Amino acid sequence: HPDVFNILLQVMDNGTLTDNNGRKADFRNVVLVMTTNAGVRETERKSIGLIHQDNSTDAMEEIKKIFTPEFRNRLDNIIWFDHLSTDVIHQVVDKFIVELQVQLDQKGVSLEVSQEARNWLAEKGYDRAMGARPMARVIQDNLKKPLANELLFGSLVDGGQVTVALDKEKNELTYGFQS
Amino acid sequence: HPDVFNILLQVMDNGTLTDNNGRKADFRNVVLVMTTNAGVRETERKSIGLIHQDNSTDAMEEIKKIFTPEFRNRLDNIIWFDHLSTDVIHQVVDKFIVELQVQLDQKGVSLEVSQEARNWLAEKGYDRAMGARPMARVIQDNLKKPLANELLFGSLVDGGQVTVALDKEKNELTYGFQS
Amino acid sequence: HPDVFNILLQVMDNGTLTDNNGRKADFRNVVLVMTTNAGVRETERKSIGLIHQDNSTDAMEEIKKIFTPEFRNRLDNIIWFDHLSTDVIHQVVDKFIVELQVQLDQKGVSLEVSQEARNWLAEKGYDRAMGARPMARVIQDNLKKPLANELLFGSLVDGGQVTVALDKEKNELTYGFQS
Amino acid sequence: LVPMVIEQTSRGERSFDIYSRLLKERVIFLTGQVEDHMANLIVAQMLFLEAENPEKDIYLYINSPGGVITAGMSIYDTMQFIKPDVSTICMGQAASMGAFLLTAGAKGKRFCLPNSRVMIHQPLGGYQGQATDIEIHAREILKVKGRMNELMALHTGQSLEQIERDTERDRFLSAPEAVEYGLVDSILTH
Amino acid sequence: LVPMVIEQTSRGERSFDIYSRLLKERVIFLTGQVEDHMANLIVAQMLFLEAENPEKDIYLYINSPGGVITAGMSIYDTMQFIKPDVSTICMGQAASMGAFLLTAGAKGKRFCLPNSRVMIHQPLGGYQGQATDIEIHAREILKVKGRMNELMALHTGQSLEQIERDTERDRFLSAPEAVEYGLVDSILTHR
Amino acid sequence: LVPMVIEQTSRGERSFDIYSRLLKERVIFLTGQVEDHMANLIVAQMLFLEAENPEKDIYLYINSPGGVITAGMSIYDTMQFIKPDVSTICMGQAASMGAFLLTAGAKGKRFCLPNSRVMIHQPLGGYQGQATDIEIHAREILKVKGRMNELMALHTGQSLEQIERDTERDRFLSAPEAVEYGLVDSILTHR
Amino acid sequence: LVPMVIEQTSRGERSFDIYSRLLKERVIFLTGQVEDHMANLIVAQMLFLEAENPEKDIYLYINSPGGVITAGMSIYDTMQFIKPDVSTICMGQAASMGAFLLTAGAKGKRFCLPNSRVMIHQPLGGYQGQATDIEIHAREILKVKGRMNELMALHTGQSLEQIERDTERDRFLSAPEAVEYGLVDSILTHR
Amino acid sequence: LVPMVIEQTSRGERSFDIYSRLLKERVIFLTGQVEDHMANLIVAQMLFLEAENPEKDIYLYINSPGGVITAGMSIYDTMQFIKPDVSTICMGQAASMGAFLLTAGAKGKRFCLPNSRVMIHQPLGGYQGQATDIEIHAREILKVKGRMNELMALHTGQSLEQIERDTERDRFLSAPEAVEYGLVDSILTHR
Amino acid sequence: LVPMVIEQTSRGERSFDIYSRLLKERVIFLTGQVEDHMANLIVAQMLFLEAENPEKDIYLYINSPGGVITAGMSIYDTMQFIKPDVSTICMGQAASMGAFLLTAGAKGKRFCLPNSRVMIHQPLGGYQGQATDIEIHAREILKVKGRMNELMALHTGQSLEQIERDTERDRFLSAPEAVEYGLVDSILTH
Amino acid sequence: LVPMVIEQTSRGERSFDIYSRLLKERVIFLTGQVEDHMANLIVAQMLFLEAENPEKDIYLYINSPGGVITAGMSIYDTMQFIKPDVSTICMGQAASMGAFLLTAGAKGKRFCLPNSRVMIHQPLGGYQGQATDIEIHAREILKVKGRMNELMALHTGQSLEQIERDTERDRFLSAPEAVEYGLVDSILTHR
């Protein structure tokens, strides 16, 4: 709400915010970070019509109307992020697997994920509209759900030797368990 | 809230404000100052039509709507602040440079900037709508940022003697660290 | 209210709920479950059409609408309870009869329930919207209410040997009294 | 004027036209002479309801005294390539296209009122101008007439020779006669 | 233009039309000449009220100079189909079709104002074409004409011959003369 | 176009059309030729006001040049039936079936403006066809003629014979002359 | 299409059309041929303003070419009935029943624009039929004519003979001529 | 259809019409044949803008092909009445009344596009009936003609004799030629 | 009166028309005689859909009886210029210009209903006046026929000789026969 | 009916018609015969877009079959006056007036679809009356014809004699021929 934006105006310029009891919130040491998706819609979306106009400055113009000039003036800098590349997304899959691999390595269960499975998870896990947020969800349902069940009972409790794979006939992810 | 302005009526006319316990405050030796940016948007607003119309009158007409007549009648004077001119920015740049020299004087570093750098830096950060706050960012982005890396680790850790100059060919500033 | 849903979202993400007093509570070892009696109204809703035979059979869609999409992402899976069958209701009626029989043992009074009597109780005590909830009241009014009248005065004061039957024509329960 | 109605939803109260409420329950209304304009509205209602929930069934009432063949045919084709069974009910009166659209619903779902009056006759049209243009135009309507009797015989199940003979001229079929003829079933008043 | 009215609901104030507000109280107005579009609107109102409260009885005020018989029949069938009793209170004037719907109301709930005037006649229809077409077309005119007599006798209770002779030509039945005939039970003056 | 007026209330501000704002104050406007459609709004408005407050009086400003006799009876029947006293004011002009509603108002709550004019005449109508049908249609005009004079006589209090002789032809009565005739109780110079 | 305007208030912003916004400041526009329907809006607007403030002065901008004389009298009766002084202004032309409402304003508040033209003439009407009916209707227009001259004489202050003389045929009274003939007090060029 | 336009107000987002947004900026549009109704709407826009900011100047884009003379005088009088200078711009074409309003703007604020056109012609009107009435009407048309020429001479600056001789027959004046005649101050090709 | 469908969105409930709600699903309807205003409306919808999703294919129904040829070109050129593949589902009568739009659809995405009727004929126009003037207009209409015949052959794929031959006289083609001529890919399976 | 399109915003969804949504993207639509009313809407949109962003170019689609030349000047003059360059895209067809506005766009931004047509011919305006009046009006139409030819020469680049020859009689210019004549730089196939 605009009432909240007004509170932040004094925070940036003076570094202090008063409370109900009158205590001065001296927090000039805290770093302030804000996240917004206001201008992304204009960047990805092209201008309507047969001819496409220059939309380079259209993203910045949206921030000028949404945020008041005094608020934007107090900001030290605006950090414009860029969409993830094809190679960058592949590294994200390795990052999540490393957490699962190291989490299970101490338990004694080795994990060997095939390259085919990593590529499939990227497309399904990363949505352009919703970002890479579903990666944690699909990883949980695809990997944590089956392995967790066999962990308590079955051969997977000890020995590890887990090897994941993907079949081209159905595009599904196969599972491997050994003692 | 507009209803909050009624509290300042007696303060500006009666000179006192009673508290919950009946204690009467004295504002006779108090200087009351208020800041507002109501008429700013109306002035910068671009009129629609073939013949451009002067919107300078909209500055005061908006103030009258926000503050009732009884509130404005008590005010000693309503001072309207004007946009900073190019000449004023040159003096403002010297102020920020002096402030920067006080920060460096504590560490022992001495900063000397040429006049040519000041003129180029003024034009880069000259924004009429944003007043003089942008001048802080250009100083921060151009002068403080290269200095922070050297002050922490490098030649400027002890001794200083920083020289800032701009070469016409590159049209960018040059920094010389002499420890 | 909307603010209540956000309180659950915080614990689902961070797993720690702060207190104004300052106590730190951990939900790591606390299982959280919530029930919602939504979609039953939509199913039982009478169709505006002329035939009135339209059935929804899509109550799961209403569940996703009443809850925000953010809440759905945090929950891994939702449990759905299918409508009970008439045969299963018969077992619920026996539960209330067993408790009644145990209560009567302290006085030396027996209770016999016919197979046809259970059918009447099951239909009367089972509602589509409320399920087995009326069973407690239906069992009490049909069985316990008259019993007390005879138990207070009549043959049932001593001897027990209670018997229950229902007339087929009128479908009304008649309880024989023996001394 | 269209009276407004309030719906007490879980979120709160919502106000919309009476036709909009019935549309929410998959109850489409066909009234007046069929034309290219109202045809799109009827088809638009079927397409929107299909996307919302194709498992459920759609309802359609027929209270038209006739209409264009091409305009009414657009509604017939819609009911075929959609999974929801489009129930057909005759309210007040039917006609050449009303009866065709009335008998086009899924077998069993089609119903009719007791005092309904149905009317069926061959397509009526004419073209004036050069003899060559009249030949192709006149020859074309005969193919459409045979097509109408062919598709009508499928849903009804009657022989092609019988349905075309009765449809050659004006044929009025009341509610009881319609059941015997095989055009529609009887409404379940119970 | 229709005026607007405000309803002081417990939740808050809500604006409704003069017809929409009355529709919320189970009240339907059969105003204007009978037609397929206007009759279809009445059908929609009856179905909506049935689902809201089938136990409650719907109220209908018949005020129209008559019209097409085919469209009016749709109201008759829907009225008996719906469980709620369709009360019929003739206001101002009732024509042949208007009176036909007036009799359709549930026994004991039909009413007529003191100065209301009823009128009943036979269906008026015409056709042009070859002699063979008029014969088959005219047959349906006699069937619908005779069919309406049986439906009128079911509610009115009068003999078929009595309705046939009276329906042959225009007959103006005033409010008291209509209750004696049997079309309505009594006038609505007090309760 | 109809202007929009603001109604200040403790709950807040509400916007209503110029006609709806006066309708909230129990003021109804009978403007234009009498008809079934315009009569439905007047009838619907009276019923809404009765439920809101059946004790307060209802005011009806009648400025009409005359219209359908059948539609007017619908308005007249409702005015008497409902418990509230439907006060009537003749603004600008009153004619056949427009003036009848003016006198139909409750006794002691009928008024006329100082420069208002009111006229009355017998029902005008016609029919074309066979002599047999004309007989029935002609009889209806005489039936309504006698009934209309009986009502005007009951409200005005004049002899039934007086109304028929005076209403055979157009009679233009000025605002002061209306009081002598009995159509209205007095002139609306002030309350 | 009427443009919409915003009214800045402490509570908030209210969007109103141009005509309704002016009504908020006691300004009523009488433009177009006088009729029974448009007359209700002017009458309803005057009553709404009286309730808001029964002491302030209402303003009526008359820019109509004339019309029904009996319909216009409903505005004049309301103008004198309500306690507020209904000031009148003449925009463009003014004709029969347009000028009558222009001169009906309170003394000292009636004004005219410098270029506004005023036209005054007797009522024009025609009726065909029986000789007896024509005589009855003829007396009405003659009686209304005398009432118009008598009423106009009071406001303007001229004798009934002189106003009757000018009203026999059309008389185009310019803005200066109108002030001279008592139609208005003065002009608005300097007030 | 009228396209909507969003205004980035300090309070928040606000939707306005294409004409409403321009009206907020004191830009009024005069189009189509002059008439009483449209002229009243233009007058309403001028009065509303007067109180909002009298110091500022109003702008008017005239693109009318000519119309009623009576309605046009109401616009001219209001322009001179209100303190703000009503700037006038001739978009596309200006007829006799359109040109009379174009030149009526204050000095130093009248402009015309380069490819715009103007036309001035004597008032056109006719009367039918009795000879005496034609004489009264005949003098009125001539009287109005002398009034327009007298007023046009003041704004344009040409002698009344020059205006009368030229205005006997319609004369089309282009944008450059119009400045020479004194109707407009300068062209609007650039400022 | 057009119905007012309701849409379920996380932000809140929104009210849309039947045509407007269908526009969200990339469904566009065409009906009635082609007009300048009607054509510009279809063009406006196409431009909006392109910006929303340039990959998702658009659907355009056709139930018009034909109209002015000039305005129809604005819809054709727009369909080719936009990146999304606009399918063409002929649900009813399709005249020369109506058929031209059906052929203009993306190859492998055009469709037609089994009972739909499509008729193509040479452009029909008339003009009167001076001898010199009629000659100019006469030459222009012939040029338009050549352009329509040339573009029709390109989309349909049939030889120009066959296209110009049958188009001379009024021709009526059914839905199954259209597949033989290459006018449409295939009828809807379900 | 015009469809509604929703645009997602941070605070809440906004509903706008298809024509207004495209207008937000600087896309104007000129459809149908030119007129003083429709032209007023086109210029209003141009002025509104200029205030929003005086740098971004405007896009004016042209699918009009021709209209009055007077209204066309308002659009042509407005296009040249505003700083933003207007991009004219010929959709379907461009008549004499439409073609004039088409070529009136900034150099390098005028385009035509491959199947669009461009027709140009002299004005068809006609006048009737007395011989003296015809001579005055006849001389005026020649000036407009010469003025249009001169303006077309500046944009198209051809000599006045060449434009006169081509404009003497009706001529239809195909999309590729338009590039040869000099009305547009090239076809709109790539961007």
Residue numbers in the entry:
A (entry chain E), B (entry chain D), C (entry chain F): 570 to 748
D (entry chain M), I (entry chain N): 2 to 191
E (entry chain L), F (entry chain K), G (entry chain J), H (entry chain I), J (entry chain H): 2 to 192
Q: What's the publication's text?
A:
In two classes, the NTE is bound by a spiral of pore-1 and pore-2 loops in a manner similar to substrate-polypeptide binding by many AAA+ unfoldases. For example, density for the ClpS NTE was present in both the ClpA D1 and D2 rings in classes I and II, but only in the D1 ring of class III. In classes I and II, residues 2–15 of the ClpS NTE were built into density in the D2 portion of the channel, but this NTE region was not visible in class III, presumably as a consequence of its conformational heterogeneity. The register of this ClpS peptide is very similar in each structure, with the C-terminal portion of the NTE (Pro24–Pro25–Ser26) near the top of the ClpA channel, and the N-terminal portion near the bottom of the channel in classes I and II. In classes II and III, the relative height of ClpA subunits was A (highest) > B > C > D > E > F (lowest), whereas in class-I, subunit B was higher than subunit A, resulting in a shallower spiral when aligned to the bottom of the IGL loop and the two flanking ClpP subunits. For example, the D2 GYVG pore-1 loops of all six ClpA subunits contacted the ClpS NTE in classes I and IIc, albeit the D2 pore-1 loop of subunit A had a lower buried surface area (BSA) in class I than in IIc. For instance, ADP is bound to the class-IIc D2 nucleotide sites in subunits E and F, but the GYVG loops from these domains contact the NTE. The presence of 11 engaged pore-1 loops (five D1 and six D2) probably contributes to the high affinity of ClpAPS•N-degron complexes assembled in ATPγS13. For example, in class IIc, the BSA values for the D1 KYR loops range from 63 to 196 Å2, the D1 pore-2 loops from 40 to 156 Å2 and the D2 GYVG pore-1 loops from 101 to 179 Å2. In contrast, the D2 pore-2 loops only weakly contact the NTE, as the BSA values of these interactions range from 20 to 74 Å2.
